[PDB]
Amino acid sequence: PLVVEPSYPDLVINVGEVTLGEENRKKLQKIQRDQEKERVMRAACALLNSGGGVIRMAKKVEHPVEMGLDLEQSLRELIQSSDLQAFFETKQQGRCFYIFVKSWSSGPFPEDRSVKPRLCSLSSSLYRRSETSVRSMDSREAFCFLKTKRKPDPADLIFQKDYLEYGEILPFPASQLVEFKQFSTKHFQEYVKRTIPEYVPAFANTGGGYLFIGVDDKSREVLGCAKENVDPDSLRRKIEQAIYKLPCVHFCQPQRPITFTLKIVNVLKRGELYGYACMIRVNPFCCAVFSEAPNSWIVEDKYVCSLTTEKWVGMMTDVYSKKGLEHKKELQQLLFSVPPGYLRYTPESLWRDLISEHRGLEELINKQMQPFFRGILIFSRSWAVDLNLQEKPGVICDALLIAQNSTPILYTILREQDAEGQDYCTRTAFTLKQKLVNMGGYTGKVCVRAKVLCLSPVSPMDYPASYSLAGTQHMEALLQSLVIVLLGFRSLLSDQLGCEVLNLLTAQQYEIFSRSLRKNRELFVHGLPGSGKTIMAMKIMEKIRNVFHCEAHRILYVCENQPLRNFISDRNICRAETRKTFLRENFEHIQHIVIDEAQNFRTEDGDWYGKAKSITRRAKGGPGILWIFLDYFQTSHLDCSGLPPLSDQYPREELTRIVRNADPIAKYLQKEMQVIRSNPSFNIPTGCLEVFPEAEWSQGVQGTLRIKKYLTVEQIMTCVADTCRRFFDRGYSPKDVAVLVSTAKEVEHYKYELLKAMRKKRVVQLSDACDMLGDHIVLDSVRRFSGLERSIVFGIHPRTADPAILPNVLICLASRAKQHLYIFPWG
Amino acid sequence: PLVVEPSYPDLVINVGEVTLGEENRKKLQKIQRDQEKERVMRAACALLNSGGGVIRMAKKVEHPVEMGLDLEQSLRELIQSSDLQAFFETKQQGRCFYIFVKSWSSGPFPEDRSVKPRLCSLSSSLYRRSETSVRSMDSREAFCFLKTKRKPDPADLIFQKDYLEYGEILPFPASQLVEFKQFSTKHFQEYVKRTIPEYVPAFANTGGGYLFIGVDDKSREVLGCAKENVDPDSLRRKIEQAIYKLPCVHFCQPQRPITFTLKIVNVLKRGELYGYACMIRVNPFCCAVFSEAPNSWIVEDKYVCSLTTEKWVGMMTDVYSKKGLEHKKELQQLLFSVPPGYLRYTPESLWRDLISEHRGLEELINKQMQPFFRGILIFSRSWAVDLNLQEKPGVICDALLIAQNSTPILYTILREQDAEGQDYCTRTAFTLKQKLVNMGGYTGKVCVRAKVLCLSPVSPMDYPASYSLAGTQHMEALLQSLVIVLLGFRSLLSDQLGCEVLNLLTAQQYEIFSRSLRKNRELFVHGLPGSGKTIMAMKIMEKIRNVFHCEAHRILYVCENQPLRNFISDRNICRAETRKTFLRENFEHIQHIVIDEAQNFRTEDGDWYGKAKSITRRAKGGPGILWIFLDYFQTSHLDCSGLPPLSDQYPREELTRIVRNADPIAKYLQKEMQVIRSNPSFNIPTGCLEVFPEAEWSQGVQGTLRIKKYLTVEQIMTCVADTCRRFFDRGYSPKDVAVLVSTAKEVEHYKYELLKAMRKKRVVQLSDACDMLGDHIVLDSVRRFSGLERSIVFGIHPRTADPAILPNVLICLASRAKQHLYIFPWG
Ligand SMILES: [Zn+2]
Ligand SMILES: [Zn+2]
């Protein structure tokens, strides 16, 4: 049988010795030629249905030879096209002949999912009647026939007649519903065994028909067989067994077997019995009937196996990221933008830490990359872990080189030479190559070379020139399929791609939301937690400045918390001030006012709502823009916020899509929002909390949410330090971690405890919530962290003075984490 | 040549005598069999590419026979499928054999434009190299190849040699880029003339290659030719002549011809010259290269003609109503809904008039329809005129029957027997059948029978049972294609479908607009003329009642005009009152107020806006709905309307989409809206008229716009009376005509004069805009007709006291007409 060779970064199938050349193949016996051709097509079909590979055959001659007319025609039938170069390319070195097979269908959601079949097969074993002949359906015809089946006569008069005279002339000829089969007495029982699978499936697949046994094809005469040889009882059961043996695949309820009518009649010659004749009426079948199992092959594990009949049908008719597939062009342009003229190392943060940690790594990488003048080099601490494989101790880093005029190469750097070094790099290159095809949906020709380098001071195949990345279009298309592959795993670039999907999802909701600037002057935006309410507020001011043609300092941003005010002031898009400064300082020069987290405002310091209305109403261009952003789920106090009653909060805009948190984070928010609705606060208006998110909305970005309880303060602090070190070891930046506590009075106590456990991790410096641009871990209270967002958030002991607000601190906490969240509740 | 015979309601091609039956067809010589097969395939290809038809052949035998294996295989290659029944079905009666060919591609915008090719061809004459063999591209392969082309070596060393030793062995074998050809000296000149056509386009279509003449294929030995026969100088001329004769179709600029390198080298034997060898290098071609003209046929006029190379490429690579195709399912249910259990006559208005004028027509039609128990019978005064054909005097009516278990039949009822009557019905049935396929996009098997009935007291071809409408699915799918056919012409059913498309376009814009009820309480809707501003006002009040669960009388509708108030009050959806009644009566029990055409209000009676706010704000559910609908393009006075300044008119919804007027009417409005912007009224605010329609919005509904000037007052009336009579003759109801004059004081003058000329047309009854339910022609002033709409509108002598308002009456008048408008301006 055919087995896959495991010492290569591809699917290599060795078929043994194959005679090549039409002159050499003609001299062979038909049986041997058929066996060799069948083995070659088995390998080719397996590689077409398994994502591509190489077919290795050893030829009996030294000089170059052609593959052969029969093999070429069989491959053409396999791919149903004369474009034989687009899938198969041949090379030969010495006594070995190679055929490099491309993948037929690439990706789980191909662009031609509803057009071309998923499987290539030698024969589908689906016969249907075509006028006076029985023909087999190829892959496209079988696909169309199964699609059709998936959705929800003069011959009768002879059939009812009970006896037939010898030599009777049948008026009707052979046609779509009538077949005349000559019945021979020498192999009469063998003849019945073989003719049933050929014609019964043909009629049942197309409207049914009649099958006459014992009637000459040309002369249409009734002859039958010898009455001595034929046993009508023994003959009847064999036909019944043969018809019931045919495999049938049902797409409907019920699933009754094949319905047919068998009639055995006496043949009379000169008024004397001469023999028996067989009439078969096959009723049309509600589904497909197979003459035998389909001849389609696929590679599972290290073996080549044939697909079962029910498994073949399922593939013909029928973590994956939906968001990554549609945004793959913009995601690639952000992270993996190919640079013209020089070779770029990504990530730059991880590359810098690698060269400083290991001496000589910078010079080793540069010496190997001299021949390459353009491309991108993607670094990682272990590319096997990024592909859910096992890490090999002693590997410094893995690099995937995607350069022009060169096939992709996966470099593995070892700090000392190891016997398993080449085996580890080969398995990761082979795994990455298969994912780029079967998961990233790459429709081109791709091969990943496995190269091993050592820091301290089997042969690869020579792929055809069409496997090399010729220009920008091929490298860009290959990188876009790597984005889909990366988004399905957990790694450094999986999260950096996951972060950019959230920014693309938020920009989609903003475009719908940004249309309200021309229609409204005073607007009350009721956003939901994690819906990007703060992000739109920043985006509108960029649009307000352009639309109204006012300078930046005319727009005023008012918030409740000091740390968020600093964030807005850093971007220089407006003047950002706290509520207290808004009431105290005079703002007669302000034209437009944007208010954020209005539910957290307080009225004891003054009447902020009236003053904001007065300033905007008295603008030069009539009424100015006064957009009030608020979310009643994140109310931080039980006092009166000074807002008008819910009836007067019009016109109103609603943000219901959660577009700033990962999938497990979003599910946590929606589950927690249900608890808030069941126990509304007394100060909160009754009808405001009746807001529901989108019925079926998924961010398509995977994250992490772990709850660890019954841990002491010392025990919690080590877990935070260990998790941060694990993230920083993989290459994350320290500016992606935020630690949030219940109250601002406990910030100083937890800060000393955090440094005590984190001093062992080579970082002893933290930043406050007031400084977000610093490359330090932010440790501050949840309430003072409102309006900000971080990639990794650790919540330590969520607590508040009033148990009524206790359900509200969690939702104000989980909404601050974009991808990773770790909560350590009270014991 | 093959010519279609014009005596049937289909494309019938007579191919003459054809031998049928495999036993009979085996006995013929290859030449005669090939000629017969090629004739049959020409007919089949013509009918496949021409919309379907019948192939008539006269067989030489009486008993039923099969068509033959070779013909079946040729048809299978023609349709590229073994499903030979879905396109060809055979019938035989006596000495004639019929093949009923279905259309390959139906409609100008099929569902498979990018999936299946448009043309069926015997051969595309496109050859491409397939490994070591040259293969011709089928229709699908040629389609894919042209789609790809439309988007914007050891053999070299031997080529550089200047002489070749006799018997030299070429190291390389024949491959994708190398071809070895033996050169025969007996017919050496004629050999070259035919070798170039099939091999040079093969290389040029796929990356190019090398062509060697004079080398043995099997042994790779260089032989050349004899010196006495081959002349190197003259041999070059024909080779470059033959390569330049290949037709080439370019998709790009520039269009340089095929580029190749020719070298003729001496063949030396034992150091002595023996002959010449020809080496050809073919550079890859930027576009497709044809060995000869494609073998595709089509029926044009009364002949069967072959498509030229330039035309064949265009069809394979590349009035029609786009809106009709989208809404064909909804349009069918409104008009042509098949009734289960009885036969329905449409239109009912035309059916009633037909039986009244002509005695015995009801008895004749009912007698003919007895066998049919289900379906729809579509009546018309002349179906030929509906299809842009010529009217035949003496025809009472034409009826198209679409019934269950019966092919469509077009009945032509004649007052008296006429010899031409059968020709008239056959030509209309043939035209209607082709429109249903080539224009309506019907992908099934359709035949339209032509039957002639006479009120006063060639054989019909028997189509197969697959042409009969078996059930509701086939009848429904056939009528949806008739909807698209009708919408492309000008007729009664074309206009009734045009009115329903406008009602579906308005319902599309309402769904977008209806989302503002949840977000707004006070709203200022700035609509454009013809945008359906009044229609949304009625639809909103039905949504307000459902959403707020209030009783119907709780909603108040306020309008300036009395005729508009009457129309709204008749629908029993709210309380409709005039502005004057609003200020006079007390409405303390009203919760929601909807104001329409607010730009026509006046302050001479009091503050209507102030009273509106007080009633709505004091509602039980806080602030009630107060939506103000206005259109500044249709202001009927220069006084103050009482609306707040343009700066205080917020929030806003803008209806910019013209969805209530046909295409000619809509283009007239936008042209006139430009004049209004070029000179706004002084009372009109500065920035309100800056509302623009969509950049590219088309209704896709045909209409009529005719402007006749310099006619006297008497001449206007007879034109209106004649136009009304011709419309009523076709079956248009009188309630579709409105006559609009400039001022209400001239209404009585024009009413008397219109009746003077219209009395000759058997209609004397006129009505005012206060009553629109009556089946009468409405005649009032333009300003009095605000808010209402009619299908046919006649504008007579537009005029106003102030020339500033002069452009305002035309835009207000034109917006009243939905499909037909006739303007008679002052001379
Ligand atoms: Zn079934
Ligand atoms: Zn070109």
Author numbering:
A (entry chain A), B (entry chain B): 7 to 158, 188 to 353, 381 to 519, 530 to 899
From the article:
Schlafen 11 (SLFN11) is an interferon-inducible antiviral restriction factor with tRNA endoribonuclease and DNA binding functions. It is recruited to stalled replication forks in response to replication stress and inhibits replication of certain viruses such as the human immunodeficiency virus 1 (HIV-1) by modulating the tRNA pool. SLFN11 forms a homodimer with the helicase domains adopting an autoinhibited conformation.
Density for a metal ion could not be observed in the cryo-EM map of mutant SLFN11E209A. Mutation of the ion coordinating residues (E209A, E214A) abolished the nuclease activity completely.
